[PDB]
Design a protein around this ligand. Structure first.
Ligand SMILES: CC(C)CCC[C@@H](C)[C@H]1CC[C@H]2[C@@H]3CC=C4C[C@@H](OC(=O)CCC(=O)O)CC[C@]4(C)[C@H]3CC[C@]12C
Ligand SMILES: CC(C)CCC[C@@H](C)[C@H]1CC[C@H]2[C@@H]3CC=C4C[C@@H](OC(=O)CCC(=O)O)CC[C@]4(C)[C@H]3CC[C@]12C
Ligand SMILES: CC(C)CCC[C@@H](C)[C@H]1CC[C@H]2[C@@H]3CC=C4C[C@@H](OC(=O)CCC(=O)O)CC[C@]4(C)[C@H]3CC[C@]12C
Ligand SMILES: CC(C)CCC[C@@H](C)[C@H]1CC[C@H]2[C@@H]3CC=C4C[C@@H](OC(=O)CCC(=O)O)CC[C@]4(C)[C@H]3CC[C@]12C
Ligand SMILES: [K+]
Ligand SMILES: [K+]
Ligand SMILES: [K+]
Lengths: 244, 244
């Protein structure tokens, strides 16, 4: 049929238009502040290097050392709590990359672990999302017909709710501002996970605050379920339509 | 029906067993080398600090400067080529996070850009994956019936092929070893994207090698399509089954 091919080319051309707009806007927003801050740091580098009479080779070596110690500033991060947090970020595909396997054996196992883990996790969050959509239909009917205008509204406000209570929690535990914590929540639950903000890294929380570690694992696995129950409603309505 | 609830609880219990096994294996693999390397770097820190008679406060300030210059070692990364690469890593949800929005305005726009972009990209890769699955069915029939034992085999070897030719390309352009380039390919195309290995960062490639930038964008968007056409075959067979 022609319809599927027209829809495919409409989606490809739309996606490349969306990328060219995104690239233009991010460049217009960020490429000047980047140059300003780079000039400022290139100045402060020479200021401190002169202030401590540091040889260029010595600065190069100190840079290499600091850039290798950058992750170990988190304290120990490979331990059972932190290995569970890593496994979460692998199979959910968040992948912050603050912890990443250092040995070749850890890399090979990480590859097989993701290989079997990601399908299984997609099938879990699909099944559980469809269960909670059915529950929402049932309870909304008991409160009365039900229509997409109600289901999508309840899904949308359930997402906005889980973002707000995530930002409220993390801006209290991590002392980020509310906007920073809300950004971290959004970037985690879409599974983008840049890793510029990462929870559990301060104050040895991975071995010191089991209640907060538990909260963060439950929040990640719950918010991903609510987002999955929203994509299950709003996107799988359209994606499988080629099979029609 | 009971079946959907039994399947949901079987998937939840399976996922938590899979996490507890993953956490145990990663801890057993990595938590000793971490402590060894941390001891080695804590030694080398004091060695160089003494070798350059560096005050502890001066070391703290040099550490702060180096840790802020760490990304700007990539040269300019917010420019049109690098903003297109960023937009790719946002809407595909790879999110390496080597570039991440520095201003609050770039963060707000990044949030709305992901919000509209990720559904659209899932629907694109679904539609295009189902088209190439239909093409594989058609051509395999022309080469003759067709069965899942053939379709899944061809999908699997198409994935292994795109990983091998990705590793072969990147281990040549980036001078990573083959295993490192294969790891980077696998971690990109599953969209985990830790960001410990990232392409295009060396030698100002973003403004110096348009042919290699083009290759990398085409490889990312093609390999994601082939992986999408594989999940479309092997997982959407099972995920929607709750709707049965
Ligand atoms: C998560 C919330 C906040 C946003 C959700 C957005 C998506 C549900 C939208 C964004 C872009 C939309 C797509 C944009 C373009 C098209 C092509 C359109 O097909 C045609 O125009 C051709 C039809 C034919 O030839 O038969 C079908 C709907 C579809 C897939 C849309 C389906 C719904 C999408 C994925
Ligand atoms: C969503 C429903 C159906 C289940 C919810 C289960 C959670 C309440 C469980 C699942 C995994 C558990 C975690 C698994 C491992 C750990 C590590 C454990 O030890 C440490 O954090 C100290 C460091 C170390 O032990 O090496 C503390 C409890 C904690 C966070 C657990 C807290 C409770 C969690 C989050
Ligand atoms: C990408 C390649 C290399 C690996 C693909 C793996 C998946 C296709 C597998 C991994 C785990 C599997 C799931 C493991 C357990 C179950 C529960 C099973 O349901 C029951 O056991 C209960 C049935 C009922 O109560 O009716 C249905 C299949 C399912 C979803 C499986 C579907 C197929 C999955 C997702
Ligand atoms: C998959 C099929 C259907 C379409 C394939 C399209 C590609 C061949 C296009 C899409 C976007 C293009 C890129 C968009 C932007 C740029 C930046 C441009 O400029 C630079 O890299 C220099 C830096 C600067 O311009 O600021 C060089 C070409 C390049 C990599 C383009 C190369 C060709 C690309 C990858
Ligand atoms: K990611
Ligand atoms: K990352
Ligand atoms: K992802």
């Amino acid at each position: 049929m022609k319809r599927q091919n027209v829809r495919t080319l409409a989606l490809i051309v739309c996606t490349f238009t969306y990328l060219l707009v995104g690239a233009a806007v991010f460049d217009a927003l960020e490429s000047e502040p980047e140059l300003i801050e780079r000039q400022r740091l290139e100045l402060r580098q020479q200021e401190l290097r002169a202030r401590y009479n540091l040889s260029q080779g010595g600065y190069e070596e100190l840079e290499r050392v600091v850039l290798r110690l950058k992750p170990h500033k988190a304290g120990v991060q490979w331990r059972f709590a932190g290995s569970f947090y890593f496994a979460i970020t692998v199979i959910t595909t968040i992948g912050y990359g603050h912890a990443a396997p250092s040995t070749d054996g850890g890399k090979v196992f990480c590859m097989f672990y993701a290989l079997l883990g990601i399908p299984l996790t997609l099938v879990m969050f699909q099944s559980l999302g469809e269960r909670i959509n059915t529950l929402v239909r049932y309870l909304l009917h008991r409160a009365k017909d039900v229509s997409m205008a109600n289901m999508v509204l309840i899904g949308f406000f359930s997402c906005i709710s889980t973002l707000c209570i995530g930002a409220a929690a993390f801006s209290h535990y991590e002392h980020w501002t509310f906007f920073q914590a809300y950004y971290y929540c959004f970037i985690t639950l879409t599974t983008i996970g840049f890793g510029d903000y990462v929870a559990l890294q301060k104050d040895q929380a991975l071995q010191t605050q089991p209640q907060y570690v538990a909260f963060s694992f439950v929040y990640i696995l719950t918010g991903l379920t609510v987002i999955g129950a929203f994509l299950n409603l709003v996107v799988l309505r359209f994606m499988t339509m080629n099979a029609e």
